[PDB]
Ligand binder design. Structure first.
Ligand SMILES: CCCC(=O)N[C@H]1CCOC1=O
Ligand SMILES: CCCC(=O)N[C@H]1CCOC1=O
Ligand SMILES: [Fe+3]
Ligand SMILES: [Fe+3]
Ligand SMILES: [Fe+3]
Ligand SMILES: [Fe+3]
Lengths: 241, 304, 239, 301
């Protein structure tokens, strides 16, 4: 590499610098280096899962003050944090602003107290329907528009490559829930999630109904589910069917 | 005050800032309070008796000089310390750990002494001097806040590149930046920056990058030429970056035709050296040109 | 001072915001595609349901006969360039190895001159899979242009999906279903495995009311049971 | 090397005909189809037709002639060679054609071209200006010149009120004329040539930065540039234009007149364009550019 001569040079340098990395800590380290190269003090990377639908998991990892992470998870501010929730509705970057936080005033006041006075947040959706988010923050300088665009671009590149490398390294934060379905079980679940009954699946797949119900039992066992509704819903949410 | 864009005259520069000595190698004076003062830039040795005189016009007591900020180790920015610190009992010299330890390395202090001793006026009589390792020094770090005065809070910023120890001082209240040679030598005749990369070009450019990010500057004070103001000081860092890359392109083109480093060194000398004849032997200026050209040829990005 | 690419980005944004009709958006897309050096482009939206026969709508500038053939043989189902987006967000350069599983599609596309090309996927904020392809006939993709393209295509598809959603295009539209907070919360609980009685207990209402709400939801989804309703709601990002 | 500079074939498809100072460019669209770019001067027709003979077997297969703008050094061959390529469509911006229709402009161009002939050269045949096979083109118009030549037109006002440039998207090759300036053969940087409007000049350089990364950059003087020089050509031209702006404004803040810097710039630059530009006109153009800059430049506080 990340250098000066052109943006494409920085892109290729970042790629080559990140290719040999076999440890997630070093990946985050390169990310932090480039973030500070951009001009901000702290950064953060958040993963919002789709389930449980009532209380969806929102994991976070970054370089905000650890006391702020204590408070953030203690009061579970991550549930209704506008910077993250924007990604459910837009592919655009979000620059932190008072108007944005009119809904969650306590979180914004506490973040300002911890120095997170200026910042921005970029969301993206992984190909497995996860909501990944990359936030940057500093204390004293507001974001101008030209820097807004510069950031938007560089952060997009960085979060894309980061999610790619973290999927390649099978990080626990992104692993969500490791579940593998067999071809037979996956197609049976595809048919069930389309509304077909056990007997209709038995007819279609040219197998017995006892076999189909035993496959349902196995599938429920994998999802730790009590019935087929939970299994089908979580599979649809996780992109397994 | 003044409509001008560059203030280059000994005397008062701002409600709290004065320039002392020769405008070529000036020493800047800050009034922290009624009986508290600070100095910036170390200048050259042969100006000792001059600076002192000027200083005494402003400060009624030398004991009220409490701090002396130094950018880097080069002979032309710390030659006054051994001669004038004995007259400033209450002074703390503030420099980067690399600069502070340089003042301990026999060889570096010998180079400084030789180069400063070579710039005397016929029969100049140097005043007594104290040891370099005896200076009242307190090392500083990157990003430290120097609580000089109630209305003087200056931040330290690492500006490596020009040298392996260069640092700059940002008075954030007045958006004032003492930048030394981190941007280079200002061309008084053309209004552009002359790159002064004498250690590492990657670090030089990265430091100029980081400095571009500071709040819009109202006062830009390099180690030579006085004080810049207005739009000239606002985009100083970006302009230095641009001129450095311009010289890189020129060097690389001249090499693509088969030239040597020393041909362009001679050219750059003939074009630039005239400004620093008073405080820099010509041979050393040509050598610095050759060295900067070496570093640029090494670290510049080729064209293929 | 931070890259001449930013100029192109801002120019594209300024050119595409004042447009209030999708025709002009696609026209600007073709403008930039041809400016890069390719002949044709395409934009595809793969929906998540039906899981067995997923909808794959398309809009672009390939020959109309080739699209007729494409939909006739339902190549949208097993098109590798599209299916890459289900598991990866990285760009795909067209190559024989990519099409070894669907060789007939690749052979026919080559017959249509679509010999060189690439396809970049992205996931809309509504669990839809959008994809942007570019293609030419005679010139293979060089490396530096490979990366430059990749970046430009990413930017363009991002802004295109944004502007088309803002323009409410039918191709991006999905099955229109609206749930109230109460029924949506009931479905959230059901899709989490709760039974009728457990939901009635939690929401402090009767079980008859909960089963009547289940009937309401299935009636809207044209579903035979609650499994289909829950799965389609999860797939559509409604819970 | 890093710079190509010689008459003849540039790459697998193109040729540079005539003088590298006022060159014409030849596109081989297909087996039996050719096109031309830049109208050159009258002084070089005697070199044109001949050096062309080495590459083209039949002159009748020239179907297009592209003109950047109306300057004498990029247009003065219409009377010389146009009559003998009967199936040729000159393609030019409305400004350029209308200039060709005016008597004063053609008189200026004819005088400036006459100023460059040799005491032995005799003038070949000539034709009229309003009778040319002209067709108006528009900004962004796509020229399907050949099966492997799809070039787009881009309006690059600034150097003049009509300058336009051509981008081959397949080879990422940009013919830019003077919109970027005069390439310094000794230093490798760009010399601004703002002779009409500075804001239009800078905006044109911007719009050109929006193109894909360039592999080949072909101005009106010097030849062809490859590698980095072609990539950041517009960026560097913009930077050097702003550098000249700053130099002029600084010198004016010290109480110096435009004449000072005009004479200095003549001394330092005119040596390059002495073969195709009377020195007095070089000084006058330097002064015109400095006046435009001093008028439109951003001041300081
Ligand atoms: C996952 C990203 C969340 C994030 O950046 N939150 C910021 C917004 C303001 O205070 C915070 O903690
Ligand atoms: C949704 C777009 C998919 C696409 O354009 N696929 C390409 C691969 C080769 O022939 C095609 O049709
Ligand atoms: Fe120095
Ligand atoms: Fe110095
Ligand atoms: Fe011209
Ligand atoms: Fe010209």
């Amino acid at each position: 590499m990340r250098n000066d001569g052109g943006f494409l040079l920085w892109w290729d340098g970042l790629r080559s610098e990140m290719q040999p990395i076999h440890d997630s800590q070093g990946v985050f380290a390169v990310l932090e280096k480039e973030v500070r190269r951009l001009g901000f003090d702290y950064y953060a990377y958040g993963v919002r899962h789709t389930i449980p639908f009532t209380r969806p998991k929102t994991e976070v990892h970054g370089t905000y003050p650890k006391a702020w992470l204590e408070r953030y998870q203690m009061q579970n501010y991550g549930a209704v944090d506008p910077a993250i929730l924007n990604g459910l509705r837009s592919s655009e970057m979000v620059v932190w602003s008072d108007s944005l936080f009119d809904q969650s005033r306590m979180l914004w006041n506490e973040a300002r107290d911890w120095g997170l006075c200026v910042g921005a947040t970029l969301p993206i959706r992984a190909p497995n329907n996860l909501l990944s988010v990359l936030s940057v923050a500093r204390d004293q300088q507001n974001i101008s528009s030209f820097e807004r665009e510069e950031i938007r671009l560089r952060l997009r590149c960085m979060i894309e490559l980061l999610t790619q490398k973290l999927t390649d390294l099978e990080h626990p934060m992104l692993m969500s829930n490791p579940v593998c379905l067999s071809h037979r079980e996956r197609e049976i679940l595809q048919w069930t999630a389309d509304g077909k009954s056990s007997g209709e699946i038995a007819i279609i797949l040219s197998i017995s109904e006892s076999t189909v119900n035993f496959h349902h039992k196995n599938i429920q066992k994998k999802f730790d589910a009590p019935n087929k509704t939970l299994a089908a819903a979580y599979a649809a949410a996780l992109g397994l069917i | 005050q003044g409509h001008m864009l560059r203030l280059s005259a000994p005397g008062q520069l701002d409600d709290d800032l004065c320039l002392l000595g020769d405008v070529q190698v000036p020493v800047f004076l800050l009034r922290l309070g009624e009986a508290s003062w600070a100095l910036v830039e170390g200048g050259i040795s042969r100006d000792a008796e001059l600076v002192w005189a000027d200083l005494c016009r402003w400060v009624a007591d030398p004991s009220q000089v409490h701090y002396w900020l130094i950018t880097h180790k080069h002979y032309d920015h710390c030659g006054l310390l051994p001669y004038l610190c004995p007259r400033l009992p209450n002074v703390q010299v503030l420099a980067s750990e690399r600069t502070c330890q340089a003042w301990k390395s026999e060889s570096a202090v010998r180079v400084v002494e030789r180069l400063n001793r070579q710039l005397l006026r016929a029969e100049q009589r140097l005043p007594e001097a104290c040891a370099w390792d005896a200076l009242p020094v307190r090392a500083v770090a990157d990003g430290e806040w120097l609580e000089l005065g109630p209305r003087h809070r200056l931040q330290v910023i690492e500006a490596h590149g020009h040298s392996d120890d260069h640092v700059v001082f940002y008075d954030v209240r007045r958006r004032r930046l003492f930048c030394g040679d981190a941007l280079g030598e200002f061309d008084e005749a053309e209004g552009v920056w002359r790159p002064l990369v004498f250690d590492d070009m990657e670090a030089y450019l990265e430091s100029l990058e980081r400095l571009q990010r500071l709040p819009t500057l109202l006062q830009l004070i390099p180690g030579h030429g006085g004080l810049l103001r207005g739009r000239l000081a606002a985009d100083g860092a970006e302009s230095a970056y641009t001129e450095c890359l311009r010289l890189c392109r020129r060097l690389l083109w001249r090499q693509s035709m088969g030239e040597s480093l020393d041909e362009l060194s001679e050219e750059l000398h003939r074009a630039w050296g005239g400004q620093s004849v008073d405080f820099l032997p010509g041979e050393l200026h040509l050598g610095s040109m050759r060295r900067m050209l070496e570093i640029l040829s090494r670290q510049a990005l080729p064209l293929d």
